[model samples]
Target: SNAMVSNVNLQKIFDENKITGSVTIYDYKNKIWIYSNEEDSKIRRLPASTFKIPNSLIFLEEEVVKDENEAMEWDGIKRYIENWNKDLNLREAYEYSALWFYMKGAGKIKSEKYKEYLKEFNYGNQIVSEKKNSFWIDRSLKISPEEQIDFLINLYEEKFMLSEKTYKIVKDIMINEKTPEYTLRGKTGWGREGAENIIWYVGYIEAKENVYFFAVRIINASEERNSYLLDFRKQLTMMAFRELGIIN
Candidate 1:
């Protein structure tokens, strides 16, 4: 864990953005020192939509639906985003960071089972109320970038010691980007405008020879819930990869 720290050129972007966040690179293959306005890998914080990674797992584990393509119809509820108005399947829900999809699934999951999933994965804080669909968003469940690495590393290996059906389902739907040299699979998220303003981009990358699992989290980074600051998390991680020679 004695990884060296470097204030590389890309660190400038963090300052320019005018917010403090942390980026952790756990070199699942070999190397691991990696950055930000401020840094720590283990401090648990609200994960916002990044919880979808685990949320998706629970959905499949409990056999909530058949698979990612199982469609749930939109009830004509007007949301802030236009694309979310139509029926969305799991793949679309995960890709779009659609709020309703995960909330719907969260409601179906037995609360005790969800907590068990958290403890089994050693998820952060592991303190959850009996309430469904609201715990993660309401800051009832929080995780740090460090714990995130543990959970993701297991997912990268096909599961967090879960059923094969759950493993394949988790793998099938986590695709964000895929190619020959590298594939970037991650999630982006933001909390309510007032209650903590949490934001994140957390996931891993698989290169030709090694896999790098990284997480970026910024809390209270903006007053606007879906501001540009929240959206920049993925681009920031990409910049780090380029600097690390993990991608072009």
Candidate 2:
């Protein structure tokens, strides 16, 4: 199975990268998945910026924002709840991860509407049970690797109930490629609470007719930040691309 093969390959890459803890990969087309290094299949972790996909789509569909050109003012302050002052658009919020965006995206929604969209996108676990709260603490938002893969596939296929124009805008902003030869689209997640060192790399590659969607997470490291995580992700992605014969 490609799952087993990819697992072994991921383990090797993790080792080479000096990454500790777990690693997982899913090939959606074949429904194949791999896990290595005692990774838990059920443990739920905070989604961080990875949650922005749904947030972005919600804003886009609801017309809270007109287009990617829209911008929201920022005061450079951390406002976790409703008391904060600032305004931002879908693009600015996503691009800057302005706290305002999270607040409005999750806060402004009506309870029924939020729940409906959450369920529609299968983001069931992450939404708070209370349904009225504007803030969700760490561990309150949880998602499994399987669910992560599902969300990514839906995004890739435009399965979410977003308009075509909105989808394209969000998709373009999410993807950041270091090289023109490759296309990478993903949101980085840094859960600042219990999982301080956790980071996520979820995105797809378009090389010819083959499109591959993947999510990579590294958790519980000693350092607070590492600039190389993005580089590591790109390195592994390039390795995979070459291995899959998508690039020279």
Candidate 3:
């Protein structure tokens, strides 16, 4: 009925894994089965690459590229993260989590326009630093796990007010997993803010005649949590889902 301060299932994921973090889950149809295990779930942290979700929506809204399949040619700059070297459109960029692809798109949008989209979405601390693909990762931008859940819920309700075409495009791109029984969609992100290294697995599930949204974040302070998140971020979230019976 109301937002509770704790959820045992979500808390156990943290305790068993020894993570200092949070997870927030919302029942779309009910909305009151709000599960929040950690107070840090309300605490903000860098969005890392998860910013791509809104960033993609903004690109489509602004007409940067025509659609998801529009192939963006890669410049001849072999940077870190090699899979990004080939030609890719929004679909590949998103699925690949290609850093360079979004960086190119960011440079094209003009800072003012990009910030406008970010602000309109009410994304993370809503800070747009004058850095190329650096703001989300450099810790200028932040979002709480609870806010991530809220954003997805609105999205599931078709409340972003963009054209149906735009909605279709973003939704198509976000489809990470789907089954006969249900569908799962989300994005993953990791970055360092200060003493803590943060990583996030955020998205939603639709199954058994209901929609559920979830956000999982792990943080480690005073040490090398980056590697920790990489190793356990997805696994921890999956284990939590199994515990919650959200997945089999």
Clash count for each candidate, listed in order shown: 0, 2, 0
Q: Of the pair 2 and 3, which is ahead by lDDT?
A: 3
Which ranges in model 2 have alpha carbons more than 4 Å from their true place?
1-7, 16-18, 28-31, 34-42, 75-88, 129-137, 178-180, 192-196, 224-248
Relative to the true structure, candidate 3 reaches a TM of 0.90
lDDT of 3 at 105: 83
TM-score of 2: 0.77
List CA RMSD, all candidates.
Answer: 2.7, 4.5, 2.2
Expressed as tens digits, the lDDT of each residue in 41-132 for candidate 1 is 66777777888888888887787778888998888999999889899988888888888988887878788888899888888998786657
67-186 per-residue lDDT for model 2 (tens digits): 877765566676675334456666656666565556655655777786787788886384665634333334466676557777878888888777899789988888667465657676
Poorly placed runs, candidate 1 (over 4 Å):
1-10, 31-39, 192-196, 220-226
- All candidates' lDDT scores? 0.77, 0.64, 0.77
Query: What's the true lDDT of residue 19 in model 3?
Result: 68
Candidate 1 residue-wise lDDT at 222? 52
